[PDB]
Write an enzyme that holds these catalytic residues in place. Structure first.
Site, mmCIF file in Angstrom:
data_model
loop_
_atom_site.group_PDB
_atom_site.id
_atom_site.type_symbol
_atom_site.label_atom_id
_atom_site.label_comp_id
_atom_site.label_asym_id
_atom_site.label_seq_id
_atom_site.Cartn_x
_atom_site.Cartn_y
_atom_site.Cartn_z
ATOM 1 N N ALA B 66 34.888 107.840 45.699
ATOM 2 C CA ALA B 66 34.004 106.715 45.388
ATOM 3 C C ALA B 66 34.620 105.860 44.288
ATOM 4 O O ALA B 66 34.569 104.653 44.346
ATOM 5 C CB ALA B 66 32.605 107.222 44.971
ATOM 6 N N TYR B 95 57.647 110.724 41.083
ATOM 7 C CA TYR B 95 56.954 112.015 40.915
ATOM 8 C C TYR B 95 56.693 112.760 42.226
ATOM 9 O O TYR B 95 56.994 113.936 42.346
ATOM 10 C CB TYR B 95 55.608 111.812 40.215
ATOM 11 C CG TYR B 95 54.843 113.110 40.002
ATOM 12 C CD1 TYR B 95 55.289 114.073 39.097
ATOM 13 C CD2 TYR B 95 53.666 113.362 40.698
ATOM 14 C CE1 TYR B 95 54.563 115.269 38.891
ATOM 15 C CE2 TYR B 95 52.947 114.535 40.503
ATOM 16 C CZ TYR B 95 53.396 115.478 39.606
ATOM 17 O OH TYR B 95 52.650 116.637 39.446
ATOM 18 N N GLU B 141 62.005 107.946 47.123
ATOM 19 C CA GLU B 141 63.158 107.935 46.270
ATOM 20 C C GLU B 141 63.946 109.274 46.318
ATOM 21 O O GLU B 141 63.732 110.129 45.449
ATOM 22 C CB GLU B 141 62.636 107.646 44.841
ATOM 23 C CG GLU B 141 61.898 106.283 44.761
ATOM 24 C CD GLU B 141 61.384 105.917 43.342
ATOM 25 O OE1 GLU B 141 61.849 106.489 42.334
ATOM 26 O OE2 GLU B 141 60.531 105.021 43.251
ATOM 27 N N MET B 209 64.957 98.225 42.928
ATOM 28 C CA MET B 209 64.629 98.753 41.592
ATOM 29 C C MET B 209 65.834 98.571 40.681
ATOM 30 O O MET B 209 66.429 99.542 40.204
ATOM 31 C CB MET B 209 64.196 100.229 41.680
ATOM 32 C CG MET B 209 62.826 100.300 42.433
ATOM 33 S SD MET B 209 62.204 101.995 42.564
ATOM 34 C CE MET B 209 62.457 102.601 40.938
ATOM 35 N N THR B 210 66.133 97.295 40.408
ATOM 36 C CA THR B 210 67.240 96.904 39.547
ATOM 37 C C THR B 210 66.908 97.000 38.065
ATOM 38 O O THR B 210 66.942 96.017 37.332
ATOM 39 C CB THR B 210 67.725 95.507 39.925
ATOM 40 O OG1 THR B 210 66.613 94.654 40.272
ATOM 41 C CG2 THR B 210 68.622 95.641 41.189
ATOM 42 N N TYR B 211 66.534 98.203 37.650
ATOM 43 C CA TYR B 211 66.263 98.516 36.237
ATOM 44 C C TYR B 211 66.475 100.017 36.095
ATOM 45 O O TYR B 211 66.851 100.703 37.089
ATOM 46 C CB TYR B 211 64.851 98.062 35.790
ATOM 47 C CG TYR B 211 63.772 98.390 36.799
ATOM 48 C CD1 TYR B 211 63.288 99.687 36.933
ATOM 49 C CD2 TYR B 211 63.225 97.385 37.608
ATOM 50 C CE1 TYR B 211 62.271 99.992 37.846
ATOM 51 C CE2 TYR B 211 62.201 97.685 38.523
ATOM 52 C CZ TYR B 211 61.742 98.981 38.626
ATOM 53 O OH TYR B 211 60.763 99.272 39.541
ATOM 54 N N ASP B 212 66.283 100.551 34.891
ATOM 55 C CA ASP B 212 66.618 101.967 34.657
ATOM 56 C C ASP B 212 68.063 102.221 35.003
ATOM 57 O O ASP B 212 68.403 103.348 35.439
ATOM 58 C CB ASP B 212 65.801 102.955 35.503
ATOM 59 C CG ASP B 212 64.378 103.038 35.071
ATOM 60 O OD1 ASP B 212 64.094 102.615 33.931
ATOM 61 O OD2 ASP B 212 63.546 103.553 35.878
ATOM 62 N N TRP B 400 57.787 96.305 37.407
ATOM 63 C CA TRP B 400 57.103 97.537 37.076
ATOM 64 C C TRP B 400 56.834 97.435 35.556
ATOM 65 O O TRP B 400 57.817 97.465 34.791
ATOM 66 C CB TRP B 400 58.045 98.732 37.302
ATOM 67 C CG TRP B 400 57.397 100.051 36.871
ATOM 68 C CD1 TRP B 400 57.468 100.661 35.644
ATOM 69 C CD2 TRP B 400 56.501 100.854 37.663
ATOM 70 N NE1 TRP B 400 56.658 101.792 35.630
ATOM 71 C CE2 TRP B 400 56.063 101.929 36.855
ATOM 72 C CE3 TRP B 400 56.023 100.759 38.980
ATOM 73 C CZ2 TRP B 400 55.169 102.906 37.320
ATOM 74 C CZ3 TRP B 400 55.134 101.735 39.437
ATOM 75 C CH2 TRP B 400 54.719 102.783 38.614
#
Lengths: 496, 496
Positions: B66, B95, B141, B209-212, B400
């Site tokens: 709900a 995760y 991933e 995901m062009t970061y990290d 993100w």
């Protein structure tokens, strides 16, 4: 277990048609010059060359007088009375007929194209073998291209099947009919079919490497034509195998194929042994019974590694048969090639040549200081090193081009038989030298290694080693959670 | 219009205790997304859903249904202010789906067979309709080689169902969409790089995901999202040269220089090098957060220094050493801080200095007293990334994540302004002299002009000819084969 000693017997169509054993002006090297002693030093004689015709069948050249052809071949098979184990093979192809721009090239391509063309071609090989009395088939196509390789392989398998049935039907278990091919002895042509080497060698008794003619007038600087090991002072070449259709990764390609590299006999042998499924016992090392000559060379390092002015075309334009003292070059109309027999006579002439030795390549060369000539050839001394190499690497034997070029005493053939078989020859202490060895590593020669078993669920650091499915693997980068073989992150580095 | 795709991430515990009047429970409720912000977004990716052991898309089992419906309703209500806004849901994330993730086995097994793919695809459409979403985003991933064909088949299956549902629901004006998040660095990208054109075919967008690209897992501090390379910074092993492409050594080397600078431009250019990948479907990802490192030397503002930051996932109590970072205490990790929090640390008297790298076009913070380094992005680095997106004709930007922007929504506003504001002009923005990725592959071969190939000709080394649609160059000399028939020719250009 006895090493093979395979000598080519090359007789042009005009000499077959006018065969005679008493006029060296017409037939320089008649069969009668192969004495019982030489017959016992040989294991195979490759009669050359037959061709493939427009009908896509093995055949004698059309200008051949069949009655004379049969008579020459019968004189060769008669040699078996002196050596029961001797095999008289026939060779199909050769550079003239089969090179890309050769007179019969299209017939080779077409003969192996379809299931129907292959069957017909294979049966014609067995027919010629039986009809003329030969002991086996050698195919010298120089050389099939990538698209023709699968058909070539299928044709060899078909011939193998037919020969094996023929050996049983003929009761030849003690001396089975054999199948061999001549293979490239340098990376540039080897790259054409290299990726399928294991499938090509499977149906063969031997693959005879043409580990000579590695230097010619088509090159920029003079060089040894059959160096055993490399000379850092000599030229190096582009390693064409790194471009073969292998499907390997960059790291795999780079460690198997260093580039530039020294174009030597050792490099060709090691490149074949790097492929999985290629047994050392089927590889035969080819050696030349002739030298190649260059003109316009420089003084400095005995004519070695010098620019030159030798014409590189086929044929050669009457311009001086500039090879001092080479009478044979005059009747053959080319001063760029000379038989060991002719070379020996030039050395012990008063022609002005000096014999020098290169201790890294383990080969001799002649230098003419006055006329600026350079000649690269092999002799009984260089053969000591090559025969020791054959034994250490457990190769199948040696092959040479060609019988008519040995001196009258048959010294070159006698040296090879001595090094492999004489009880009073001992090369245990022969110094193989410090020349450069080919050091590539491939699937076929991975070192045996030990490593802890791969554990699923484990995260591996860069450079970690694990054993999985028969091999030892190493991570190429870090934090690897995938299994060897399922990821491009693992490199196979060892076996067991 | 360029896409502007923002992630809204809300953990299961926040959904279950959802409230808009207590930032101690829910730091960033949906009410923080005003009509102004809603007009600046084209897509919001609600994250994350998962795949259960029954191999169907599902909410985490601890979710109060709900409350989940109430949160999604608050998001879809935003469509009131922006009729073209799509609320997508994202399945997976690190995760749940990483190799060692809790639900990884479910992703692998869901794509295995036609039957499991049909069931899984059906469940995605069912969830989409039941909760009122506008499309599906999958963030696995990452699939590994063996799993890739199954993943591609699952995407095709979902695409057929969405296309049908669009007709059914009369949604032709705002069709349902399918996207995936892809790797932004070569190490993970190498897992599926060879099938990139097949993966992108069924999608509306692939969000990179062009970061990290930098983190405590590396031994030297670096920018996590440099646009271009800084020659003074670290370089990395180009993993794509190890992908299963089947290309030759020369082709691999030309496409994948190594070492190379791990940058946003490299990831984009690596995708554009493959044939069949349209630039319009590529979306560049940017971070709304920074990554911090401790124990850094002083040489260059803490850039490219060794450091003593733990890399383990759950961090260990030890000093939330990033001075002035309150969020870090509550999230129990001093290694990541939202832009909102970084801005506050810069405004306080904590001792941070904001520096700029003009090669990478990114900012960084340096704390001299405590030896701290933080890499992040801001409205100034976004000017260059936005210009890059327009120059390269990409589909848009993704980030993100929404909850990390400051209260005024300055980062989102900046991105909307750079693409759409009539009063913003970046025509004079200098893109700098940082290192550009210059590999050449199948999809970016240049138009070249060369004489046609002529059969029967022998070509020298380095010769160029046009044949069957391309311009080819010989890699060694004395070539008698036609381009494409053996390994002597290298494709270097396309024929007009």
């Amino acid at each position: 277990t006895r090493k093979a000693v395979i000598g080519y017997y090359f007789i042009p169509t005009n000499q077959i048609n006018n065969y005679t054993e008493t006029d060296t002006s017409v037939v320089p090297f008649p069969v009668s010059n192969i004495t019982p002693a030489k017959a016992k030093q040989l294991t195979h004689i490759n009669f050359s060359f037959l061709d493939i015709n427009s009908n896509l069948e093995c055949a004698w050249d059309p200008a051949t007088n069949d009655a004379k052809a049969r008579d020459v071949v019968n004189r060769l098979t008669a040699l078996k009375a002196h050596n029961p184990s001797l095999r008289i093979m026939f060779s199909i192809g050769g550079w003239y007929y089969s090179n890309d721009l050769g007179v019969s090239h299209a017939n080779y391509v077409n003969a192996v194209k379809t299931p129907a063309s292959r069957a017909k071609f294979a049966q014609s090989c067995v027919r010629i073998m039986k009809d003329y009395g030969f002991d086996g088939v050698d195919i010298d196509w120089e050389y099939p291209q990538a698209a023709e390789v699968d058909g070539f392989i299928a044709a060899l398998q078909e011939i193998r099947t037919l020969l094996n049935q023929q050996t049983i039907t003929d009761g030849r278990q003690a001396l089975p009919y054999q199948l061999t091919i001549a293979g490239a002895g340098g990376a540039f042509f080897l790259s054409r079919y290299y990726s399928k080497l294991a499938q090509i060698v499977a149906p063969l008794d031997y693959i005879n490497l043409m580990t000579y003619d590695l230097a010619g007038p088509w090159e920029k600087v003079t060089n040894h034509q059959a160096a055993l090991f490399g000379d850092a002072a000599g030229p190096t070449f582009y390693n064409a195998l790194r471009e073969a259709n292998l499907g390997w990764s960059w790291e795999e390609l780079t460690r198997a194929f260093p580039s530039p590299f020294s174009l030597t006999v050792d490099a060709a042998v090691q490149q074949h042994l790097m492929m999985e499924g290629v047994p050392s016992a089927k590889i035969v090392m080819g050696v030349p019974f002739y030298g190649r000559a260059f003109k316009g060379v420089s003084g400095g390092n005995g004519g070695q590694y010098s620019s030159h002015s030798t014409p590189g075309e086929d044929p050669y334009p009457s311009t001086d048969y500039w090879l001092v003292g080479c009478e044979e070059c005059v009747r053959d109309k080319d001063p760029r090639i000379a038989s060991y027999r002719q070379l020996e006579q030039m050395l012990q002439g008063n022609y002005g040549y000096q014999r020098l030795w290169n201790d890294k390549t383990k080969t001799p060369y002649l230098y003419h200081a006055q006329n600026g000539l350079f000649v690269t050839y092999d002799d009984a001394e260089s053969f000591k090193y090559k025969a020791k190499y054959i034994k250490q690497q457990q190769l199948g034997g040696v092959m040479f081009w060609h019988l008519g070029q040995d001196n009258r005493n048959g010294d070159l053939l006698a040296a090879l038989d001595r090094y492999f078989n004489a009880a009073d020859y001992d090369d245990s202490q022969l110094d193989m030298g410090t020349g450069l060895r080919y050091t590539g590593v491939g699937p076929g020669n991975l070192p045996i290694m030990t490593a802890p078993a791969y554990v699923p669920g484990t995260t591996y650091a860069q450079g970690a080693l694990v054993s999985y499915q028969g091999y030892v693997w190493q991570t190429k980068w870090g934090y690897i959670t995938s299994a060897p073989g399922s990821d491009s992150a693992w490199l196979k580095v060892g076996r067991v």
